[PDB]
Every structure is written in C-alpha cells, then in structure tokens.
C-alpha cells in the first residue's frame with residue numbers, strides 16, 4: 212500500500 | 224566457441240547502457256564503496272558508529288536510539304526505492320510494459336535489489352551510511368534491543384557470502400535488471416513480454432560474467448542461485464517489518480504528502 216504509492220509517484 | 228558477432232556486440236551495448244544508467248541512478252557505486260572501505264580513496268574518511276557514544280556524536284557529524292536508527296533505515300529505503308524505479312525506467316522495454324505490471328515488478332523486486340546493492344557497501348565490520356559519510360558496525364547494530372538487534376544481521380550474512388563472488392558495478396547493473404523483470408511475481412497481467420526482456424538480460428548477464436570473470440566458469444549459475452538467498456532474506460525481512468508494526472510504534476514526508 213505505502214510501497215505501491217511511492218513506486219507509482221516515482222514512475223510519473 | 225564464443226565469437227564477437229553482431230548479437231554479442233548488441234549484448235555489450237545493452238550492458239553499457241545499463242551500466243551508464245546505474246551510475247546516474249545510484250549515488251554511491253560499489254567501485255567507490257570499496258575504495259572507501261579499503262582506504263584507497265582521497266574522499267572524506269567516514270565517521271565510525273561503533274558504540275552508543277559514537278552514535279550520539281555521529282547524529283551531528285524518538286527518545287529511543289534503536290527507534291531513531293530504524294526511522295533512518297525506513298527513510299533510506301524510500302529513497303532507495305526512488306533510485307531503483309529511476310533505474311527501472313532506463314531498462315529497454317520496461318516503461319512500455321502495462322503500468323500495473325511495472326508497479327508489480329518493482330513492488331516485489333525492490334527489497335531483493337536493496338539487499339543486493341547494500342552488500343556493495345558492507346564488509347565483515349559494518350555498512351557505509353549517508354552516501355559513505357558514516358560507517359555503522361555490524362556488532363553495534365547486533366547490540367540494539369530486540370527486535371531491532373536481529374534486523375540487519377541476515378543482510379550482513381548474505382553480503383559477506385555475496386561479496387566473495389567479487390562482482391563489480393558492470394556485473395551488478397545487469398543482475399539488478401534481471402531481478403526487476405521476474406515473470407513469476409504474483410499478480411502479473413502479461414507475463415510473456417516480461418519473460419522476453421528477462422531472456423535478453425540473462426543473455427547479456429551471462430556474456431558479462433564470461434568476459435569479466437575468467438576464474439569462475441559457472442559464476443552465472445552461482446548468481447542465479449543467489450536469488451533463493453534473496454527471496455528468503457525478503458520473506459524473513461517482511462516478517463520482521465510486521466512484528467515491528469505489531470509490537471513497536473514508528474512516515475517519510477513524501478508518503479504524508481501523497482495522502
């Protein structure tokens with residue numbers, strides 16, 4: 212959940 | 224007979240592309256880390272945290288030390304995930320995957336890559352921190368009260384074995400790309416496109432290790448065997464993350480703003 216947030220932001 | 228043919232030349236070009244991107248994404252490289260650890264650099268000598276008094280002084284050069292140290296670990300892992308994601312964007316084909324598959328790959332891969340690359344910054348004595356500005360001893364970390372005392376120790380156990388393979392940044396750039404494009408991660412939508420990129424990266428890795436390691440004929444196989452060590456490390460790591468959430472208190476600022 213927290214990990215996925217950071218990943219999605221960083222890919223954008 | 225290995226030949227320097229168009230196919231091999233392209234695999235060397237793919238290896239260089241990843242190496243260059245690796246250098247751009249990752250502030251402290253294994254080449255520089257090993258220079259620091261062996262005292263063969265002109266850069267500033269790291270401050271050594273080896274006891275409670277050297278921790279206090281080091282926090283210059285939470286009421287609870289073990290918690291403060293875990294807090295710094297947590298913030299560093301957010302930073303590392305950002306660096307690995309930037310790297311992942313440079314791997315040919317990766318950003319062209321379904322965005323859900325890109326996310327799945329990184330969510331299941333980042334911990335394996337974090338402990339692979341943390342080994343570059345580790346020796347029998349300890350680990351470089353603050354991009355090589357500090358050195359925290361393995362035994363000082365082991366001295367932290369349960370459950371923090373046993374948090375990093377399995378990553379040291381992995382790293383002294385891993386470091387014995389004497390991989391360099393050129394080897395590691397491809398190895399990490401292979402980890403990211405693992406078609407066996409749970410919940411992947413479209414597996415074959417991932418397998419196809421992994422297959423090309425496995426060819427590039429195998430050729431890298433043949434050219435770069437004339438004295439270990441089966442280093443490629445030895446490296447693929449290290450993925451079971453990494454999976455176990457991450458399985459055990461995730462169990463410890465939970466116990467710490469259940470039994471302790473402590474978010475990174477980026478995470479607070481995302482909500």
Ligand SMILES: *c1ccc(C(=O)NCc2ccccc2)cc1C(=O)Nc1ccccc1
Pocket residue numbers: 213214217293295296297299300301303304337341464
């Ligand atoms: C230190 C403490 C916690 C974690 C970790 O896996 N936390 C879970 C998490 C949740 C959301 C986003 C990121 C992470 C990792 C560490 C750790 O290994 N830190 C580290 C990483 C690289 C180099 C040095 C230290």
